[PDB]
Every structure is written in structure tokens, then in C-alpha cells.
Amino acid sequence: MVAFGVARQGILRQNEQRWRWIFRSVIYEPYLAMFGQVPSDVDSTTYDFSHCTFSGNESKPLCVELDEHNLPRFPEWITIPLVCIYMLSTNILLVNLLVAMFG
Amino acid sequence: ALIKDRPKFVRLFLENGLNLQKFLTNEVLTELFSTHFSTLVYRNLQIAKNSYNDALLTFVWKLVANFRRSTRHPLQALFIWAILQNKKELSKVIWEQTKGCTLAALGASKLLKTLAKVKNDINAAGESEELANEYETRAVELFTECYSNDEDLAEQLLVYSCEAWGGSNCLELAVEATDQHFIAQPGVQNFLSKQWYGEISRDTKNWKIILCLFIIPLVGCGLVSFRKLWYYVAFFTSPFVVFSWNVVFYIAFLLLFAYVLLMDFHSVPHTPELILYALVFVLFCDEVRQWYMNGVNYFTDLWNVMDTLGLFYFIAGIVFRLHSSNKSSLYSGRVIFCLDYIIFTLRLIHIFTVSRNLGPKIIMLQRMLIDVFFFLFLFAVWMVAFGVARQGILRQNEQRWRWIFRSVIYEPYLAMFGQVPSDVDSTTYDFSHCTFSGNESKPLCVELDEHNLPRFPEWITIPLVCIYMLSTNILLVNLLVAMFGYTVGIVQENNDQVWKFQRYFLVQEYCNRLNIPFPFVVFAYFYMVVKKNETLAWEGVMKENYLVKINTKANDNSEEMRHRFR
Amino acid sequence: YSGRVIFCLDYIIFTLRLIHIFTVSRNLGPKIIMLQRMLIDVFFFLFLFAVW
Numbered sequence: 140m141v142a143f144g145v146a147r148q149g150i151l152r153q154n155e156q157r158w159r160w161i162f163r164s165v166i167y168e169p170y171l172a173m174f175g176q177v178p179s180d181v182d183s184t185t186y187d188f189s190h191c192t193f194s195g196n197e198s199k200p201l202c203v204e205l206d207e208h209n210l211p212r213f214p215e216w217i218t219i220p221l222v223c224i225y226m227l228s229t230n231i232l233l234v235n236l237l238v239a240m241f242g
Numbered sequence: 243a244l245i246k247d248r249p250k251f252v253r254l255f256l257e258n259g260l261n262l263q264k265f266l267t268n269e270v271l272t273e274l275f276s277t278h279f280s281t282l283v284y285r286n287l288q289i290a291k292n293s294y295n296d297a298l299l300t301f302v303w304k305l306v307a308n309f310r311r312s313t314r315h316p317l318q319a320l321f322i323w324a325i326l327q328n329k330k331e332l333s334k335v336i337w338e339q340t341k342g343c344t345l346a347a348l349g350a351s352k353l354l355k356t357l358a359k360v361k362n363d364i365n366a367a368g369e370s371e372e373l374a375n376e377y378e379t380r381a382v383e384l385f386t387e388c389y390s391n392d393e394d395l396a397e398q399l400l401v402y403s404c405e406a407w408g409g410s411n412c413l414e415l416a417v418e419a420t421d422q423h424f425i426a427q428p429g430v431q432n433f434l435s436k437q438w439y440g441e442i443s444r445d446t447k448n449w450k451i452i453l454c455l456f457i458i459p460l461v462g463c464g465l466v467s468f469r470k471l472w473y474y475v476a477f478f479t480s481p482f483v484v485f486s487w488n489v490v491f492y493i494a495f496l497l498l499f500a501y502v503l504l505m506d507f508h509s510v511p512h513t514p515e516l517i518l519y520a521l522v523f524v525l526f527c528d529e530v531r532q533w534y535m536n537g538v539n540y541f542t543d544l545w546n547v548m549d550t551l552g553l554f555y556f557i558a559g560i561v562f563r564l565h566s567s568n569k570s571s572l573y574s575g576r577v578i579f580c581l582d583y584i585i586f587t588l589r590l591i592h593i594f595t596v597s598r599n600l601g602p603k604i605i606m607l608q609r610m611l612i613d614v615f616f617f618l619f620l621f622a623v624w625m626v627a628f629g630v631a632r633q634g635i636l637r638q639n640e641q642r643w644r645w646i647f648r649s650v651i652y653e654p655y656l657a658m659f660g661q662v663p664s665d666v667d668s669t670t671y672d673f674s675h676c677t678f679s680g681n682e683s684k685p686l687c688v689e690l691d692e693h694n695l696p697r698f699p700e701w702i703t704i705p706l707v708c709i710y711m712l713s714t715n716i717l718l719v720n721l722l723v724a725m726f727g728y729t730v731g732i733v734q735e736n737n738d739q740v741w742k743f744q745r746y747f748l749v750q751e752y753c754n755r756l757n758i759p760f761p762f763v764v765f766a767y768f769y770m771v772v773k774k775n776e777t778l779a780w781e782g783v784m785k786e787n788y789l790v791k792i793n794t795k796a797n798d799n800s801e802e803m804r805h806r807f808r
Numbered sequence: 809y810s811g812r813v814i815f816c817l818d819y820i821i822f823t824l825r826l827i828h829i830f831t832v833s834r835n836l837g838p839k840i841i842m843l844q845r846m847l848i849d850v851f852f853f854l855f856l857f858a859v860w
């Protein structure tokens with residue numbers, strides 16, 4: 140969880156500057172990914188915005204880094220495989236290993 | 243008798259008054275090695291020495307060649323001669339005479355193990371393997387007897403180094419021949435534990451010493467039992483405390499790395515980033531020292547390669563991010579740093595293989611890769627089939643690689659854990675996300691017949707997805723669970739024995755170094771660059787005791803009654 | 809379109825042939841072979857599931 144959350148947050152948003160949301164993104168969401176929901180809906184560019192906050196005034200996650208124009212700057216070809224591997228590892232392999240050790 | 247392989251007659255001659263020490267003479271040994279050495283065995287030994295080679299292979303080959311051409315340790319030469327021609331009883335008879343036997347037995351087992359692989363014959367390979375196992379058991383039993391009788395002398399014998407038998411101790415030969423059983427025995431483990439705790443007593447509660455690590459003044463008090471100021475030096479020189487300090491330093495380094503990466507990362511590096519660079523520099527210096535100590539064999543381990551890759555990734559990230567003028571490079575440098583952070587963070591699993599509670603379970607992970615591979619093979623085949631079929635029947639002439647791969651592979655893969663593979667399989671809901679043209683970044687529309695009605699039939703799609711989900715999400719996962727359970731049950735009995743070997747590797751590698759706390763080891767390396775018999779007799783006595791024990795165990799059959807009846 | 813659908817089903821059939829051909833790998837073959845012995849458990853599972 141630590142590795143995945145830190146990497147994802149670093150590549151996606153920049154200079155968060157709010158402790159509660161740093162900890163919410165880094166730990167809470169990967170933890171929720173253990174049972175069910177995919178860790179991040181932001182890993183895919185197909186859908187984004189309308190929940191973003193360029194400033195920190197509101198209580199929402201910091202926006203994604205943007206290059207020239209409004210297009211997101213993060214590449215999907217490094218995010219999607221990362222989340223796929225993380226889910227395949229946590230949600231399936233580890234739980235089955237726990238079952239075997241319990242048995 | 244030696245020529246004709248008469249073990250019993252050899253024993254009788256030796257025990258009836260013959261002086262073997264005087265027997266073995268330079269001329270006699272030269273005549274014995276020069277000619278009686280089997281030509282087949284001679285060629286095989288030459289090939290093995292020339293091709294594979296080893297710390298002891300070269301030594302034995304050189305000794306053999308020297309004797310053929312023309313202290314001394316002649317009895318060891320005779321024992322080697324007997325072993326190399328596969329004489330079990332004669333080899334044992336000669337072994338019973340050597341002053342140092344445990345080392346001799348381990349060396350013989352190593353030699354047999356290295357010579358058995360080359361031989362193509364199956365039966366000869368099996369015989370050599372059996373002989374090597376017999377010698378390994380002999381050495382283990384002898385050392386157990388020695389340790390049970392006397393402990394300090396057993397440890398001294400372990401530490402004792404030969405005068406060019408192989409230039410190595412029993413530990414080195416046992417580890418080199420991957421003799422897990424010998425090292426796993428209680429005596430060697432206790433010796434390693436004593437060396438691991440250093441000065442500190444082994445009976446102290448671990449939490450006491452961990453607590454004392456943080457608060458310095460607590461060490462001066464009597465909380466720590468030093469007996470197995472001077473206390474500070476005796477404490478900070480213990481490899482256990484150095485390892486704990488290095489772990490703490492590494493964790494703090496990770497915290498600083500994460501903080502700089504996410505919270506404070508600007509075009510021009512600030513002070514915390516420079517401190518991070520300094521810490522990475524000391525880590526790189528340690529890695530360079532580790533490179534120097536070993537050769538290219540150091541790169542044969544996965545974790546070492548991973549660490550080297552992490553360091554090179556850090557250097558690359560530094561290179562990319564110094565172009566403060568161009569924004570497009572700072573982001574790439576940050577991404578490189580994120581990947582390097584993943585690599586560094588995965589190192590905790592490697593370092594925590596010594597915890598005595600997590601280490602065995604971490605070690606056993608390497609044995610489930612075949613089950614994982616089979617699972618992935620079936621999953622990939624099914625995903626390919628289902629995705630190709632569904633895409634073909636639903637949309638036509640996609641003509642965009644990224645979306646072909648997104649639909650064919652990504653969605654069926656997501657179907658493994660949770661969501662149904664496709665919301666398009668059902669006509670009840672569709673459109674408002676379609677794109678007849680490829681201009682937008684959305685999946686291609688479904689094929690349409692006359693009117694706007696979808697053309698695909700549900701009676702072939704819905705059963706397909708139902709079968710695919712029933713297969714992947716339930717059956718395959720349960721099969722994986724069952725295979726994992728069986729593998730754990732099989733390998734648990736050997737996991738601890740395997741883990742003790744790695745424990746020895748740690749307890750030797752850490753003790754070998756100068757044992758300076760990590761944050762300021764640079765000064766040590768810099769000024770080092772500037773500066774850059776009786777036990778054998780006791781072993782023989784215990785060997786005699788062990789042989790007498792074997793003879794008594796053999797005679798315990800109690801069959802003498804019938805012989806006395808006759 | 810019907811021909812394309814037939815081709816898709818035939819593609820599934822052909823793709824399933826890899827499991828058969830890879831029964832000789834000396835690492836996957838035994839595990840593939842053992843699958844034939846769990847059909848009764850699968851059948852019992854499906855029987856209960858269908859009734860419920």
C-alpha cells in the first residue's frame with residue numbers, strides 16, 4: 140500500500156500540501172482496494188474532472204498535473220499496469236495464501 | 243593390498259602394528275599417484291579442474307599433478323586418492339586415521355557432489371550421491387557428538403582453520419556445498435546466535451535491548467546484561483544494534499523521500515532534497531564497497547540487481563530534473579523518482595527476512611511461482627479467447643490499437659475481481675457513450691442492422707459472459723487456493739531448514755564488515771582508502787568415541803546368544 | 809455478420825487448443841491433467857446452485 144500510494148500520488152498530483160488528503164490518497168484508497176473497488180478512478184483518462192480542485196479551498200482531492208492545454212499529463216501506460224499488478228497481488232494471491240496458512 | 247582394494251586386510255595391517263605415518267613416503271606416494279591413478283578418472287579430473295574449477299578443485303588437481311610429476315599432509319593425499327576412485331570401505335578406513343576428520347568429511351562430500359554432476363552415467367551418479375550423503379551424515383553425527391561433549395571446544399574447532407587442506411573452515415565448506423542440514427543443527431545455530439548478539443547476553447529480552455537502543459542513558463544502567471565508558475563501545479559495536487540502527491535510518495530515509503516526492507518538489511531542489519541526495523550518496527558508496535568485496539557473482543542475486551537498478555534510476559532522475567527551464571522534464575524526473583521509490587520500498591521485505599517470525603514465510607514465497615504461472619496461463623488464454631470473440635461479434639473494424647487492446651484484454655482482466663466484463667452484452671442499456679466515428683476517445687459503436695436496433699444477439703453473448711465469469715472468478719481462484727495449501731503443507735517441513743542457511747549468510751556478512759552505524763560510515767571508508775593442533779587431538783579422541791559408539795550400536799543386536807548356543 | 813460470428817466461435821475453439829498442446833511442458837502438463845478429476849465437485853456445486 141505504501142509503495143503504490145506514494146508512487147501514484149507523486150506521478151498524478153503535485154505538491155498536495157494537505158496532510159489529511161495526502162493520507163487519504165496514499166493509504167485509505169489502496170486499503171479500500173483490498174476488498175472490491177479498483178484503487179483509483181483517476182488512473183484512466185477516459186473520465187476525470189467535475190470533482191477536481193485546482194486550489195485547496197474545497198474539501199476535494201487535488202487536481203491532476205496538466206501540461207499545455209487542459210489535457211492530463213500523466214501517462215496511462217505506466218499507471219494502468221501498476222494498478223492491475225497491485226490488484227492482482229493484493230485481492231487474490233495474498234488472500235489465498237492467508238487461507239492456506241490458516242488451513 | 244591397497245592396489246587390490248582389500249579394505250579388511252588394510253585395516254588388519256594398520257591395526258596390527260603398521261606405522262602408516264612412516265609408510266607414506268615421497269617415493270611411495272609418487273609411485274602410487276603416477277601410475278595407479280585410473281586414466282579415466284585422471285581425464286575426468288583434468289576436465290573438471292579445467293572447466294568448472296573451484297577453491298578446492300584447483301588445490302586437489304595441483305596436488306595430484308605435483309605427485310604425478312614427482313606441513314605435508316600425506317595422509318590427506320592418500321584419502322583423496324581412495325575417494326577419487328570410488329572405494330567406500332577403503333575411504334572410510336583411511337578417514338579413520340586423519341587427524342582432522344570433520345573438515346575432511348565435508349571436503350570429501352563436496353568433492354563427490356561436484357564430480358557427480360559431470361558424469362553421464364545414471365548408476366554412477368546415484369552411487370556417488372549415496373556416498374556423499376553417507377559422508378554428510380558422518381560429519382553431522384561427529385560434530386553433534388563433539389558439541390554435546392564439549393561446547394567451547396566444538397566452537398573453537400569450527401573457527402579452527404586448516405593449514406592448506408582447502409584453506410577454509412568447516413563452515414565455509416558446508417555453506418559452499420549448500421549443506422543445509424549441517425548448518426541447521428543446534429550447535430552451529432547457537433554459535434551464530436552468540437556471534438550475532440556480540441557482547442550482549444543472549445538471554446536478555448529483545449524488547450529491553452530495542453528500548454535501550456533509542457535512549458542512550460538506559461544502556462549505562464543494569465538493564466542490559468553485557469556479560470555473556472567501555473559499555474558504549476561494547477554496545478555500538480554489536481552487529482545486532484548496528485542492523486537495528488540501519489533499519490531505523492532506512493525508514494527515516496523513506497519518510498524523507500516520500501515527503502520530498504509528494505509534498506516538496508520544485509524546479510530548483512531545496513535543502514531536504516539535498517539531504518536526500520547525501521543519504522543516497524552514502525548508500526551508493528556502500529553499494530560500491532559491496533561491489534568491490536565480491537565479483538560478478540554479486541550480480542547473480544535478484545535483490546542486488548534490484549538495488550543497483552534503483553540507484554541508477556535515482557541518478558537518471560537527478561539528471562532529468564536539473565533542466566529547470568523546461569517543465570516537460572521535471573515531471574519525467576519525478577516519475578522516475580516514483581519508480582525508484584517503489585524499488586527502494588520493496589527492499590524492506592528483503593531486509594526483514596531475519597525477524598525469526600516473518601523470515602520463513604517470506605522465504606517460502608519463492609516456491610509458489612509455478613502455481614501462479616499456471617493460474618496466469620489459464621487466465622490469459624481465456625481472456626484472449628473471450629475478448630477476441632466478443633469484440634468481433636459486437637463492433638466491426640475497430641481500427642485503433644489502444645482501444646482494440648483496451649476491449650480485448652483490459653476489461654476481461656477487470657472481470658476477474660468483481661465487475662461483469664461487459665455492460666454491452668445486454669441490449670437493455672446502450673448508447674450515449676457510443677462513437678460512430680473514431681474522432682472521440684470512446685469505444686467503437688456496436689454493429690447496427692436496418693434501423694437503429696443493435697444487430698448482435700444476446701442469446702450467444704450472455705451465456706458466454708456467464709461461463710467466463712463462473713470459470714475465472716470462482717473455479718480458478720479456488721483451485722489456486724487448493725494448490726497453495728498443498729504446497730505449504732509439503733514445504734513447511736523444509737522451510738525452516740532453508741531459512742537457517744540464509745540466517746547464517748546474514749550473520750556472517752554483517753559480522754564481516756567493520757560494523758559502523760550507517761549515517762557516518764563514509765569517514766571509515768574514506769580513511770581506510772587512505773590507509774588502503776590440540777583441537778585436532780581432541781577431535782581425534784571424539785572420533786574414536788563416536789566410532790566405538792557406532793560399534794556398540796551395531797553389537798546391540800543381541801544376536802550373540804545364538805552364537806554362544808552353537 | 810453471421811459468418812463473422814461463426815468465425816468468432818471457431819476462433820474460441822482454436823484458441824482452446826493451446827491448453828491441449830501445452831500438456832507437455834513438464835511444469836504445466838501435470839496440473840492440466842489433474843483438472844479432469846474435479847468435475848464431480850463442480851457438478852455438485854452446480855446442482856446445489858441451480859436448485860437454489
Ligand SMILES: CC(C)CCC[C@@H](C)[C@H]1CC[C@H]2[C@@H]3CC=C4C[C@@H](OC(=O)CCC(=O)O)CC[C@]4(C)[C@H]3CC[C@]12C
Binds near residue numbers: 214224644647648655
Ligand atoms: C505482469 C502480470 C503479473 C500482470 C499483468 C496484467 C496484464 C493484463 C497487463 C500487462 C500489460 C498491460 C497493458 C500495457 C499497455 C496497455 C495500453 C493501454 O492503453 C493506453 O491508454 C496506452 C497509452 C495511450 O493512450 O496511448 C491500455 C491497457 C494496456 C493494454 C495494458 C492493460 C493490461 C496489461 C495487458
Ligand SMILES: CC(C)CCC[C@@H](C)[C@H]1CC[C@H]2[C@@H]3CC=C4C[C@@H](OC(=O)CCC(=O)O)CC[C@]4(C)[C@H]3CC[C@]12C
Binds near residue numbers: 486489493494
Ligand atoms: C525513527 C522513526 C522515523 C521510525 C519509528 C517506527 C518504528 C515503529 C520502527 C523504527 C525502527 C523499527 C525496529 C527496527 C528493528 C527491529 C528488530 C526486529 O527484530 C529483529 O530483527 C531480531 C532479529 C533476530 O531475531 O535475530 C523487530 C522490530 C524492530 C524493533 C523494528 C520495529 C519497528 C521500529 C521500532
Ligand SMILES: CC(C)CCC[C@@H](C)[C@H]1CC[C@H]2[C@@H]3CC=C4C[C@@H](OC(=O)CCC(=O)O)CC[C@]4(C)[C@H]3CC[C@]12C
Binds near residue numbers: 141493597599
Ligand atoms: C506513510 C508514508 C507517507 C511514509 C512511509 C512510511 C513507511 C516507512 C512506514 C509506514 C508503514 C510502516 C510499517 C508497518 C509494519 C511494519 C512491519 C514491522 O515488522 C516487525 O516489526 C517484525 C516483528 C517480528 O517479526 O518480530 C516493522 C515496522 C513496519 C515495516 C512499519 C515501518 C515502516 C512503514 C512501511
Ligand SMILES: CC(C)CCC[C@@H](C)[C@H]1CC[C@H]2[C@@H]3CC=C4C[C@@H](OC(=O)CCC(=O)O)CC[C@]4(C)[C@H]3CC[C@]12C
Binds near residue numbers: 216585607608
Ligand atoms: C513499467 C511499469 C509497469 C512500471 C514498472 C515498475 C514496477 C511495476 C516494477 C518495478 C520492480 C518490479 C518487481 C520486481 C520483483 C518482484 C517480485 C516478484 O515475485 C517474486 O519474485 C517472489 C519470489 C522472490 O522473493 O523473489 C513479482 C513481481 C515483482 C514485485 C516485480 C513486479 C513489477 C515491479 C514492482
Ligand SMILES: CC(C)CCC[C@@H](C)[C@H]1CC[C@H]2[C@@H]3CC=C4C[C@@H](OC(=O)CCC(=O)O)CC[C@]4(C)[C@H]3CC[C@]12C
Binds near residue numbers: 705
Ligand atoms: C453451462 C454452465 C457451466 C453455466 C451456464 C449458466 C446458466 C445460468 C446459463 C445457461 C443458459 C443461459 C440462458 C440462455 C438463454 C437466455 C435468454 C436470454 O434472453 C434473451 O434476451 C434471448 C434473446 C432475445 O432477446 O430474444 C436471457 C438469459 C438466458 C435465460 C440465459 C441466462 C443464463 C443461462 C440459464
Ligand SMILES: CC(C)CCC[C@@H](C)[C@H]1CC[C@H]2[C@@H]3CC=C4C[C@@H](OC(=O)CCC(=O)O)CC[C@]4(C)[C@H]3CC[C@]12C
Binds near residue numbers: 619622623626650830
Ligand atoms: C493479443 C491478441 C490480439 C492476439 C492473441 C495472441 C495470443 C496468441 C498470445 C497472447 C497471450 C500469449 C500467451 C501468454 C502466456 C503463455 C504461456 C506460455 O507457456 C510456457 O511458456 C510454458 C513454460 C514451461 O512450462 O516451461 C507460452 C506463451 C503463452 C501461450 C503466450 C503465447 C500466446 C498468447 C496466448
Ligand SMILES: CC(C)CCC[C@@H](C)[C@H]1CC[C@H]2[C@@H]3CC=C4C[C@@H](OC(=O)CCC(=O)O)CC[C@]4(C)[C@H]3CC[C@]12C
Binds near residue numbers: 701702705709843
Ligand atoms: C452457444 C453459445 C453459448 C456459444 C458456444 C461457444 C462456447 C461457449 C463453447 C465452445 C466450446 C465449449 C467448450 C468445450 C470444452 C470445455 C472444457 C470443459 O471442462 C473440461 O472438460 C475439463 C476436463 C478436460 O480437460 O477435458 C468445460 C467447458 C468447455 C470450456 C466448453 C464450454 C463452452 C465452449 C467454450
Ligand SMILES: FC(F)(F)c1ccccc1-c1cc(C(F)(F)F)c2[nH]c(C3=NOC4(CCCCC4)C3)nc2c1
Binds near residue numbers: 228229232236591
Ligand atoms: F501472496 C503473494 F505474496 F502475493 C505471493 C504469493 C505467491 C507467489 C508470489 C507472491 C508475491 C510476492 C511478492 C514479494 F514477496 F516479492 F513481495 C510480491 N510483490 C508484489 C508486488 N510488488 O509490488 C506490487 C505492489 C506495489 C506496486 C507494484 C506492484 C505488487 N506482488 C507479489 C506477489
Ligand SMILES: FC(F)(F)c1ccccc1-c1cc(C(F)(F)F)c2[nH]c(C3=NOC4(CCCCC4)C3)nc2c1
Binds near residue numbers: 625706713718721850
Ligand atoms: F479451474 C478451472 F480451470 F476452472 C477448472 C477447475 C475444475 C474443473 C474444470 C475447470 C475448467 C477447465 C477448463 C479447461 F481446462 F478446459 F480449460 C476450462 N475452460 C473453461 C472455459 N473455456 O472457455 C471459457 C472462457 C473463454 C470463453 C468460453 C468459456 C471458460 N472453463 C474451464 C474450467
